[PDB]
Amino acid sequence: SKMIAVTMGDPAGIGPEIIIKSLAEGALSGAPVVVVGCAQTLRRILALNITPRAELRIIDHPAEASFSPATINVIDEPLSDPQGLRPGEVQAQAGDLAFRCIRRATALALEGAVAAIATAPLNKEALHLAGHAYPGHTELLAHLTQTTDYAMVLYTEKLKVIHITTHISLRQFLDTLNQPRIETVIGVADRFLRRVGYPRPRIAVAGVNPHAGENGLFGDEEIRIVAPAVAAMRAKGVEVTGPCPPDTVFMQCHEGMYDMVVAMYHDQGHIPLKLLGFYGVNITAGLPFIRTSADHGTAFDIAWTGKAKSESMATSIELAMHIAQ
């Protein structure tokens, strides 16, 4: 039984309650999931009657987990002051816990004690206040695993995408586009797909401009940057093609012509995925293990009220499990 670790995230946010909701009932009840988090915090949430009931089984190591419906196995990573934590506020002890849970889960994944991680949201202000000077999970995970090259993947059965960049302006994407990064991401895609079991991954690389530039009629990015990256990776034995017209390449992948598309920018890849009804499926590819997450924040405005939806947390756990098993 391949296990998933789930990190608590910021305990003052919605992470604790969406973890309990995800694991206490429904499809993931009794699933092989180990929570790395503050057990006392989980108990405070349970006492507020804002989630289904659950028994906690505290453990020291994933190999000591015992899975059953309505029980949550927890490796306790304690807050310094669990009873003093205030809901929905930026607190150093909360940012510190978010960091420590990621650190501990990462160590377990690197040892092979768990197969993958699914992360609950952290608050970057609190993370920084606690002395952890990372923009977010991605840079922290990269540091803890000595991973230089990584990229965001959206993963569904029929359409998979990996992104050259994500949360930057469209203009910045154009002004930073570069051949080394595209080659790197093609390589990350190939290794990622091999590791999920595709012996000979078929990868398509999207162009930048309409019609992939129509032979230079629109822009020069395809001839000067994208096509040379494709050629270099084809020479290195990757089954990669492109540049491909953006408005047909995702369609082609969805129809089974390719296993994954390399999208040039956030919306190029996100628009098609979310239209197909995937509004929990993001993977940080390139790390030594699979890491999933949801696109939502800590939601301090509603934290500890039971209003936050747990579906994206559950979807991220399900995805990690699916790939691991």
Footprint on this chain of its own copies (rule: CB under 8 A): 166-172, 174, 208-211, 213-214, 217-221, 246-248, 250-251, 254, 265-268, 270-277, 279
**Which of 57, 211 has the CB closer to its own copies?**
211
**Which of 23, 177 has the CB closer to its own copies?**
177
- Nearest approach in angstroms of CB 223 to its own copies is 12
CB 186 within 8 A of CB 205: yes
3-state secondary structure of 174: helix
**Which of 124, 132 has the CB closer to its own copies?**
124
**Which of 20, 261 has the CB closer to its own copies?**
261
Cα torsion 81, 84, 87, 90: sign: negative
- Nearest approach in angstroms of CB 276 to its own copies is 7
**Which of 158, 237 has the CB closer to its own copies?**
158
- Nearest approach in angstroms of CB 222 to its own copies is 10
Single-letter residue type at 263: A
Compute how many other C-beta atoms are within 10 angstroms of the C-beta atom of residue 24.
Answer: 20
d(CA 34, CA 19): 11
- Nearest approach in angstroms of CB 164 to its own copies is 13
- Nearest approach in angstroms of CB 216 to its own copies is 10
Task: Put the strands of the sheet holding 33-37 in their side by side order.
Answer: 55-59, 71-76, 33-37, 4-7, 116-119, 290-293, 282-285, 151-155, 160-163, 260-263, 202-206, 239-244
- Nearest approach in angstroms of CB 209 to its own copies is 5
Buried b (16+ CB within 10 A) or exposed e, 167-194: eeeeeebeeebebebbbbbbbbbbebbe
Residue 71's nearest CA partner among 58, 85, 81, 57 is: 57
Residue 48's nearest CA partner among 302, 300, 305, 298 is: 305
**Which of 48, 251 has the CB closer to its own copies?**
251
